[PDB]
Design a protein around this ligand. Structure first.
Ligand SMILES: [Ca+2]
Lengths: 990, 75, 43, 45
């Protein structure tokens, strides 16, 4: 996408030649037919640019170095937009324009060290921009080599080149109005002249300013200054939240023209940093500022003396230099001197103080947040001399939140930053407004002032600053921010489970894919953290408090912790011992969890025994209801009722089922089945009508019960009709099978059998594989045998029998040799067809079979027996063994999870058994400070757990090794210092 | 390698395209990956570097009787 | 990413610490020699 | 025409070709079995 690039940007060709030789820098001969003082704009013609695209320096580089040619009189907004958007460069956190003449190809060692170590390092750390001449000469070359050395030794800095068109060596190769996306640049040009220079190969971007001249210097000064000012007017990301981008000018040596440029920059309110001892045109200003409030007598001509000394003799006589120095001092607040300090190389702090002084609201904390320098912020805060205001830190906190800098927010909060007063509906709206472009949260907010209530309602279903901040972070999916807020939350466990729920639902709702997977991962991390916190809260402290923690219903959604876990499928959460013990206790209701099963049975059959001490736990009726109200006793009663129901069903079906009108027992059976139907109706109805109906029908067991009951009704209806008695009997016969299959549910309660049942459920893929394999083989062998025999019955039912049924039973040791092996049969001439025939003795083995090639029949029999009885069955064994070995853990977790659903289901069933449950359905028809202390105790445990994790991490070997590396680096730094002092003392010895 | 990196990093020393081209050829022939990496990283023009003569030289460095050598001979 | 991960591995960090300690010992020998020279020049 | 384009897309998809081929193969086996077990006679085919 570049079609607009020629549109908004224009190159400059001079309209008029002004003297043989033009002022335009081109020979008189090479000029257009249109050819007192030449003007760079008045006598210039504009046309669409023809030298855009990107460079590919021959050899090294990132294979991408964007280049542009534009007129000097170009608005900077378009340039900034181009760089930020089209070329993909991130907005700058700081712009350092490195002025400087640097006379001579070689620069002093201390200056080169300062550049390479401070300037480039700080630029990389803070993601700043370096603006210099994009030429392999002057200060630009030094900057480029410094950047290259830093990149090599670091184990990518962004620097641009603003250079005049006409002085770029080999400009022709870059000319391509269509486009020069690839671009070969011969920067190793053998000829060397000062009229033109090659482009440095270390600069990521270029700005070949043009002013209709074939060579000159300084033409780009206007554009450079305007660009710097415009960048200074922008903001540091996060919409308008970002502070004004700091822009700083660094000056080393230079000339009078550099003094003029410094004056222009100061006029444009741009801070300037001067290096002491750099050389001419730079150290003079440093000295003058050092003079500052010098005495009027004997100082007025001191400035002139300094000008004539530091500056070159030319123009020294001219008073213009002194007047310009005075004008510069007029705004000395924007000037600073780089204290040499024997090569301090502490660039960032000097820049910070210079920016603060220039500002005279921009604050150190806001700048530190704008950059990623946590150390700067902590140093500034730790400085006791500096005093901070509530809003002073509030602005910084807002910036940190908007830009997602967890470390900064942590540090700011830790420094006594009031939070309750900090958050406001306006600020919260701002925070939510920072949704990244088209994110799912943004779509949800648009579809829905934050107005976050409705989005949460539509997410969950709906069927304290920390809480709000945590919710916002979860919505925006800022992992570290959310984790930190949770660490400061109040309802830690319930908060964690709610976060897991919300993240999982959002992820299933995201078009994010791998980004959604990170939300899924964040959900897993939160679930694990909640698990660990609860495990600590339970084992290490009173279990009663843990029980209270789970049962309570916080304000997250007015739902219990267990409900949240179940809705989020937080399988890991239920897997821990504490939750299982609590669930067991609820399962036994009021009676003790240790009650032996046999004791329970004896109590069940001997109601009076419940009052004996042999079972552990008006008082009498209260105890009675407790016993009969416990979920376990309801379960046992229901099982007994179900068994009696099956017994009655079997009795009726096998004996009393007659064509006559139904008897007493059959009617009792009908009433019983109707009771079961009412029970399932109750379960479905109360367990949003469509939503709960789907929830009920989802459970497989309920599907089984429903199919059983519908088949039962179908069969009864059929039997009542006079004609369909047999059909009714048959349907009821199958319905008995369907009912009795339900008894498998009894093994979902045991501590060992439930996992076995789940694993069996997962074996069905292997079962189907074997079934289809056997089906194919059966079809093959059966058809082959039947074809070879050629029985004369040729009756479709008989054909199907001999093709499938008999081969099938051959798998299970029913091998009728007398019906296939001719040797066991009497030879007879049954059929008129030519050949021989025999007479099988079997009733359904065919009237008579051929015997043409019977040895082949026996051979096929042997092959089939082998493949079926041995190979297929053993393959199935192996597949079962492998699958069972592979899915043990997942099955166990799944059972532990569903244990809660089971318990809840049985916790609300009517107290009575199905056969009498009609009476209970009828009844159903016709119809603090302690909490605060609990939360405080939970928060204390959370703090202990967090400290334990942090300390354990800090004591790990890897962290200790890293810290030792840091200390060794510090030791080497100090060793260099003492070595330098040693050299100084050795010198002073003489 | 350290000697080469020190020599290159020395700003006083100026290098020529062929000046590094000879070194690059030597590094390739002797199979010194670090040297070639460093040389290329130092703004060494590559498109102009390779030539059919140079490529023939490179392929001529097949070690004694190697399968590549047999295949080239057969071709 | 691969290069940085390798450089941040424990083994590489330990090797780099060994290099830095060797450099420290070199400089320590230098300063010790200068210490002896200064002690001599004291008289 | 959009209609024919959609039609060809459906019937051109590899999966649909696979399903069609499977159905054809099953019918072929069924025909084979029928012929072999019933209509296979010494008389001309
Ligand atoms: Ca049910």
């Amino acid at each position: 996408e570049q079609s607009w690039i020629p549109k908004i940007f224009k190159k400059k060709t001079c309209t008029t030649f002004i003297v043989t030789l033009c002022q335009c820098g081109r020979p008189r001969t090479a000029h257009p037919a249109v050819a007192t003082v030449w003007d760079s704009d008045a006598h210039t013609t504009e046309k669409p640019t023809d030298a855009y695209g990107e460079l590919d320096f021959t050899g090294a580089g990132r294979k991408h170095s964007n280049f542009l040619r534009l007129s000097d009189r170009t608005d900077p907004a378009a340039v900034y937009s181009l760089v930020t958007r089209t070329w993909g460069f991130r907005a700058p956190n700081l712009v350092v324009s490195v002025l400087g003449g640097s006379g001579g190809p070689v620069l002093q060692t201390w200056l080169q060290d300062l550049l390479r170590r401070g300037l480039v390092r700080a630029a990389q750390s803070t993601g700043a921009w370096i603006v210099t001449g994009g030429l392999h000469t002057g200060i630009g070359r030094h900057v480029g080599v410094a950047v290259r050395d830093h990149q090599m030794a670091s184990t990518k800095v962004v620097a641009m080149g603003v250079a005049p068109w006409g002085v770029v060596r080999n400009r022709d190769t870059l000319i391509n109005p269509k486009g020069s996306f690839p671009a070969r640049y011969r920067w190793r040009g053998d000829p060397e002249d000062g009229v033109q220079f090659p482009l440095d190969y270390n600069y990521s971007a270029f700005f070949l300013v043009d002013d209709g001249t074939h060579g000159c210097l300084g033409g780009e000064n206007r554009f450079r200054l305007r660009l710097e000012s415009y960048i200074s007017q922008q903001k540091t990301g996060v919409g308008g939240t970002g502070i004004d981008i700091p822009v700083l000018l660094l000056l080393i040596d230079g000339d009078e023209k550099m003094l003029t440029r410094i004056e222009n920059a100061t006029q444009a309110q741009l801070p300037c940093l001067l290096v002491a001892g750099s050389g001419g045109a730079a150290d003079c200003l440093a000295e003058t500022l050092e003079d500052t409030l010098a005495p009027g007598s004997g100082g007025a001509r001191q400035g002139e003396a300094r000008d004539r000394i530091r500056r070159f003799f030319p123009k020294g006589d001219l008073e213009v230099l002194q007047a310009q120095v005075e004008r510069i001092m007029t705004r000395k607040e924007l000037l600073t001197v780089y204290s040499s300090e024997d090569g301090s190389e502490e660039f960032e702090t000097i820049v910070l103080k210079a920016l603060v002084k220039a500002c005279g609201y921009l604050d150190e904390l806001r700048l530190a947040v704008a950059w990623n320098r946590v150390d700067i912020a902590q140093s500034e805060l730790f400085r006791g001399d500096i005093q901070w205001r509530s809003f002073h830190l509030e602005a910084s906190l807002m910036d940190a939140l908007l830009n997602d800098r967890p470390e900064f927010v942590r540090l700011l909060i830790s420094h006594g930053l009031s939070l309750g007063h900090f958050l406001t509906p306006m600020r919260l709206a701002q925070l939510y407004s920072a949704a990244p472009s088209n994110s799912l949260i943004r779509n949800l907010l648009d579809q829905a002032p934050p107005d976050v209530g409705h989005v949460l309602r539509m997410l969950l279903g709906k069927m304290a600053p920390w809480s709000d901040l945590l919710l916002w972070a979860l919505l925006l999916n800022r992992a570290q921010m959310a984790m930190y807020f949770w660490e400061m939350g109040s309802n830690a466990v319930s908060s964690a489970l709610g976060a897991c729920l919300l993240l999982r639902v959002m992820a299933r709702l995201e078009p994010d894919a791998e980004e959604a997977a990170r939300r899924k991962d964040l959900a897993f991390k939160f679930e694990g953290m909640g698990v660990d916190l609860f495990g600590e809260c339970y084992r290490s402290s009173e279990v009663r408090a843990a029980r209270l923690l789970l049962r309570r219903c916080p304000l997250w959604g007015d739902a219990t912790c267990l409900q949240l876990a179940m809705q989020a499928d937080a399988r890991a959460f239920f897997a821990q011992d504490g939750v299982q013990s609590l669930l067991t206790q609820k399962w036994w209701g009021d009676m003790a969890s240790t009650t032996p099963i046999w004791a329970l049975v004896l109590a069940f059959f001997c109601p009076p025994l419940i009052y004996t001490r042999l079972i552990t736990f008006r008082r009498c009726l209260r105890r009675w209801f407790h016993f009969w109200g416990a979920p376990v006793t309801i379960f046992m009663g229901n099982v007994v009722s179900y068994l009696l129901f099956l017994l009655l069903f079997s009795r009726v079906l096998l004996v009393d089922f007659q064509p006559a009108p139904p008897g007493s027992l059959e009617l009792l059976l009908y009433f019983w089945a109707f009771t079961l139907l009412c029970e399932e109706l109750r379960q479905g109805l109360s367990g949003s009508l469509s939503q709960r109906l789907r929830l009920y029908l989802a459970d497989s067991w309920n599907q089984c019960d429903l199919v059983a009951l519908t088949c039962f009704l179908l069969g009864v209806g059929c039997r009542l009709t006079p004609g369909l008695y047999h059909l009714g009997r048959t349907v009821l016969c199958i319905d008995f099978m369907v009912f009795t299959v339900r008894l498998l549910h009894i093994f979902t309660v045991n501590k060992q059998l439930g996992p076995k049942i789940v694993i069996v459920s997962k074996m069905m893929k292997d079962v189907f594989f074997f079934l289809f394999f056997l089906g194919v083989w059966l079809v093959a062998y059966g058809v082959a045998t039947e074809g070879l025999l050629r029985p004369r019955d040729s009756d479709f039912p008989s054909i199907l029998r001999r093709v499938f049924y008999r081969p099938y039973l051959q798998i299970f040791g029913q091998i009728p040799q007398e019906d296939m092996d001719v040797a066991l049969m009497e030879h007879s001439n049954c059929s008129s067809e030519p050949g021989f025939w025999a007479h099988p003795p079997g009733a359904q083995a065919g009237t008579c079979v051929s015997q043409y090639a019977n040895w082949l029949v026996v051979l096929l029999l042997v092959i089939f027996l082998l493949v079926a009885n041995i190979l297929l069955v053993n393959l199935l064994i192996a597949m079962f063994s492998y699958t069972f070995g592979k899915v043990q853990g997942n099955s166990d977790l799944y059972w532990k999870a569903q244990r809660y659903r089971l318990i809840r289901e049985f916790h609300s069933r009517p107290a009575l058994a199905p056969p009498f449950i009609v009476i209970s359905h009828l009844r159903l028809l016709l119809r603090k400070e302690a909490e605060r202390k609990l939360l405080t105790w939970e928060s204390v445990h959370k703090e202990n757990f967090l400290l334990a994790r942090a300390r354990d991490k800090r004591e790990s070997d890897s962290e200790r090794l890293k810290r030792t590396s840091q200390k060794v680096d510090l030791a080497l730094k100090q060793l260099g210092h003492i070595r330098e002092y040693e050299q100084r003392l050795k010198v002073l010895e003489r």
